[model samples]
Target: MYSCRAVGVDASTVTDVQGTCHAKATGPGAVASGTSVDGSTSTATATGSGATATSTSTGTGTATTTATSNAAATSNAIGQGTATSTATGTAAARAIGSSTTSASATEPTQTKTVSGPGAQTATAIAIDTATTTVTASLE
Candidate 1:
């Protein structure tokens, strides 16, 4: 007597999010996975298959500014200066496959700045503020 068997499997996944930040910050993350399989047979055979997929995304924003002023003694002259700046950025990526499959990834970034200078006879001040918001979804 003789016997034969066949098996197959498939899966899919997705992710997304949204948020905002203002100030200095830092973040760190990590992921790990493991799998094991065992089988026994007498005058027969065993077969198995597996698949995996992954995805990721990120975003960031920044701003900077500087100002300077000078004074003269011609008529007790006064000098003052001020400046401001801002910026924004974004990024995303994706992957799909098994032992012999396919994968793709993408990333994008953007930045903007606004600054100017003024004059008076005493002091100079510069300010830079930046705000960032991100959104994501998954299934």
Candidate 2:
């Protein structure tokens, strides 16, 4: 099969031109994860006669974690994603003191101070094109 055409013009004239284009794109979305640790436990015990003991504990700290899993993994495989994050903050403190002023009528002054504080740990995890961040402070 074939076709041919021929034509002749004394004054060739052009008015307009046109063109067409096509494109396609696709991908997975972004993923983000975050974690925070701001919990702790402290205890103190003191036993004695005429005994003075002071136990001070504070959880005055800031702990935070952030993660962004964006396109870290991509494929035709079925949607399979796993993200696990764990933060453990366990603290135990004990302060024991005993003071005996004097058996006589006149007793001396006694002063005792005990401070106990434990550090904390924080963990962050992200999957599939993601980022993990953690910040922890204990006092």
Candidate 3:
């Protein structure tokens, strides 16, 4: 007589990704596996064979990306003023005044992302069994 037995256990898998700009971003991931097997065989001559295999893999990955752009422009200008006075009979007086003002302001910003993050995970389980027996009698 011959007999064989095997047992195993495993869990599930999960994955996630996130991104943000002037904000908040988060990402998470995971993976797992389990298995069980039993076998037996008997004949005048007895034979039995059994095998169990369990595999588990865990992986976590996160990706984040952000972009921002801004542009602004401003300009200001002031005119000029002039005054003149003249007298011919007894006295002559002349006065001239001029004023000018100007102002300008500009602001610009740019951002870009050419590539992003990536992740991959995998889990596998396998079980196999085989048995063979042969008998011969002569009188």
Candidate 4:
């Protein structure tokens, strides 16, 4: 006994239990309209005797579209061919995040012994260099 809908997402319903039901994960998606519209069929049917001197679209001018009906229906294609080739190559982009003078990192460093010897030289330099060759021929 289960009241799935009565219970909710957990597929439960406080309803007595017997009202409970179970479904697979994709169970709900399995149901698809079996109806077919292979071909369109339209007919202006007027049952019983009646006369239509003139009648249609109460408000037709509202939505106006003019593709000029350049096409009616399609089934085939035709000639004319041209292929232009252009030599092309691109370069990798260069970028980096920006950071203001960072407060000297507050990390504990204990590099104790520093004996007086020669050069305690520390030089840091960053250089960004790139060269792009030139060549172009497009036809």
Candidate 5:
């Protein structure tokens, strides 16, 4: 699910909301297993640049998988942010996973033009898989 809206003409209420996931699976007999993963990559370009622009992004990942094998894992699971000032003017951005955040044009001279923050905008996850197992097997 995704949502976006713009209010006011010059309001330039540029709001962006995006999210998605992917998975793969297979069947069972004596040995069966599979894996699923999630990640993100974003790229943007602007003609000139601007003085006032706000960008926010919040991301999450989810996956569910089950398999039958000799070791029997039964299931499995798994899980950068860059901002460039409009190529010409300047920009401000904030990525959050919690409460509140704020940003403003402090010194237009210094904090202006090119803005690319070295943010670790990526999901951190752990996964485990067993390719051979048994659970109440009728052997």
Candidate 6:
């Protein structure tokens, strides 16, 4: 009998005899959405949300809204344009989203190259790169 969690990048627990689990690579995947508000009469209010000024060491306040607005615009366009586009594109888009990042998360939790006599169980595994942290189960 085989009992395990889904065997993909998001898997938390896994059970396998001789199989190895590779978490989808991680990277900065921040999807900032500050668009829809830019449309209609909300432009005034729109400017405030994304325009809350907090200048960091990296850049000035002016650049933030521009970047946020652009990101949100693209997100809104892709989702609001067509019904099938939302449905069909979402499935492939997510896969592509993951596919875009193809690097090991942290050092990787690579188990023993050779399988042991008994089944191996891995738990608490998380493959989120955007947070800049990697979690893996250790025996």
Strongest candidate by TM-score: 5
Off by over 4 Å in 4: 1-78, 93-139
Residues 1-139 of candidate 4 have per-residue lDDT tens digits of 1111111123221221121121111111111011101121111111111100000111110000000001000000001111011111112211111111111323221111111222111111111111111111121
lDDT for position 46 in model 3:
7
Q: Over the stretch 35-109, how does candidate 6's per-residue lDDT look in tens digits?
A: 221111001001111111111110010111111110111111111111000000111111010000012334222
The residue-level lDDT of candidate 1 at 1 comes to: 12
Model 5 lDDT, residue 68, Cα: 17
Q: What stretches of model 3 exceed 4 Å from their correct place?
A: 1-91, 104-139
Tens-place lDDT per residue, model 3, 1-139, is 1111112112221211111101111111111111111111110100111111111111110111110011000000111111111111101211111111111112121111111122111111111111111111111
lDDT of 5 at 54: 20
Report the error of model 1 at residue 128, Å.
Answer: 59
- The TM-score, computed over Cα atoms with residue i paired to residue i, of candidate 6 is 0.13
The list of candidate 2 runs beyond 4 A from truth reads 1-91, 104-107, 118-139
lDDT value for model 3:
0.13
lDDT per residue as tens, model 1, 1-139: 1111111122211111112111111111111111111111101001111111111111111111111111110000001111111111111211111110011211122122222232111111122111111111121
**Per-model TM against the reference:** 0.14, 0.16, 0.11, 0.10, 0.18, 0.13
User: Largest lDDT belongs to which candidate?
Assistant: 5
The reply for model 5, stretches above 4 Å from the true place, is 1-9, 20-37, 43-86, 89-139
Where does model 6 exceed 4 Å of error? 1-29, 38-94, 97-139
lDDT of 4: 0.13
What is the per-residue lDDT of model 5 for residues 8-105, given as tens digits with 9 covering 90 to 100?
12313232223322211122121211222234212111111121112222222222212212111222121212222221111232211111111222
Candidate lDDT (C-alpha), each: 0.15, 0.18, 0.13, 0.13, 0.20, 0.15
Q: Show pairs that collide, candidate 3.
A: 9-34, 10-33, 10-34
lDDT of 2 by residue, 19-119 (tens): 11011111122121112122311111111111111111113211111111111111110111221121112123112222211122131222222223443
> What lDDT does candidate 1 reach at residue 18?
18
The true-versus-predicted C-alpha distance at residue 117 of model 5, in Å, is 25
Q: What is the overall TM-score of model 2 with all chains considered together?
A: 0.16
Question: Clashes in each model (backbone N, CA, C under 3 Å)?
Answer: 18, 7, 3, 11, 7, 0
